[PDB]
Design a protein around this ligand. Structure first.
Ligand SMILES: *[C@H]1O[C@H](COP(=O)(O)OP(=O)(O)OC[C@H]2O[C@@H](n3cnc4c(N)ncnc43)[C@H](O)[C@@H]2O)[C@@H](O)[C@@H]1F
Length: 234
């Protein structure tokens, strides 16, 4: 039996959008011709269709992760927390830096919402679970959790993270960066995490904020060097 959820339903034209994005991505990036976009869509579907949308596991997304596997320039990863648009905008100018949005899976899934239901093979366009009001293990949250774990595992040498100085918690231990990514930067592989605290709020040294000291101690226990910089948005 189905229930009404508290969050928006699946983005209109979801199947066509994912397929069209996959076709566009594989055209631009020749390294990915070995991917059949029909196969990618099948695997995507099998992660959440005919499943209760609060019982989704990272394991459900493994077939899609396997088809969407992609080498990346591991020494040029730019992570970010709660500052997506500015991050992307930074990498359009500093072109040699690489974010999750530049990967196939991140490009396919950007700004979309999706879920299914236990009793049917249909996409639910009516509503989907809100992460706070309904459940954390919903199709969208678990997707981003899964790809993020894997993206952090891929990084090497010097990893950069853009953080937003205008947030109450500049570093939030409970965000995706703060839980999943920070704890999966691999001790040997990654030598340094360099944080960039962005101003646009208080205009003084924000690298001494309690939450940045938290971030420093977390990183430090994984045998990774930590650096911080105050940077000003134009
Ligand atoms: C992986 O994580 C950081 C981003 O981490 P945040 O700390 O900003 O993530 P958080 O506030 O916990 O929010 C999680 C939800 O954000 C949506 N989301 C993340 N990334 C995208 C993209 N690229 N497009 C659309 N939506 C996105 C999801 O709804 C998550 O559930 C990144 O720097 C690392 F790659």
């Amino acid at each position: 039996w189905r229930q009404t959820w508290s969050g928006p339903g699946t983005t209109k034209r979801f199947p066509e959008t994912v397929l069209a994005r996959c076709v566009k991505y594989t055209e631009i990036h020749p390294e990915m011709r070995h991917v059949d976009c029909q196969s990618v869509w099948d695997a995507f579907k099998g992660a959440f269709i005919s499943k209760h949308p609060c019982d989704i596991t990272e394991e459900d997304y493994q077939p899609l992760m396997k088809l969407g596997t992609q080498t990346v320039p591991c020494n040029k990863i730019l992570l970010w927390s709660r500052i997506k648009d500015l991050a992307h905008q930074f990498t359009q100018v500093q072109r040699d830096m690489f974010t999750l949005a530049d990967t196939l899976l991140g490009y396919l899934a950007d700004d979309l919402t999706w879920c299914g239901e236990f009793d049917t093979s249909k996409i639910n366009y009516q509503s989907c679970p809100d992460w706070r009001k309904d459940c954390s293990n919903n199709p969208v949250s678990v997707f981003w959790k899964t790809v993020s774990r894997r993206f952090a595992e891929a990084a090497c040498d010097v990893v950069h993270v853009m953080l937003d100085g205008s947030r109450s918690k500049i570093f939030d231990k409970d965000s995706t960066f703060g839980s999943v990514e920070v704890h999966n930067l691999q001790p040997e592989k990654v030598q340094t995490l360099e944080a960039w605290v962005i101003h646009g709020e208080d205009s003084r040294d924000l690298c001494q904020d309690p939450t940045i000291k938290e971030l420093e101690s977390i990183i430090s226990k994984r045998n990774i060097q930590f650096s911080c910089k105050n940077i000003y948005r134009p």
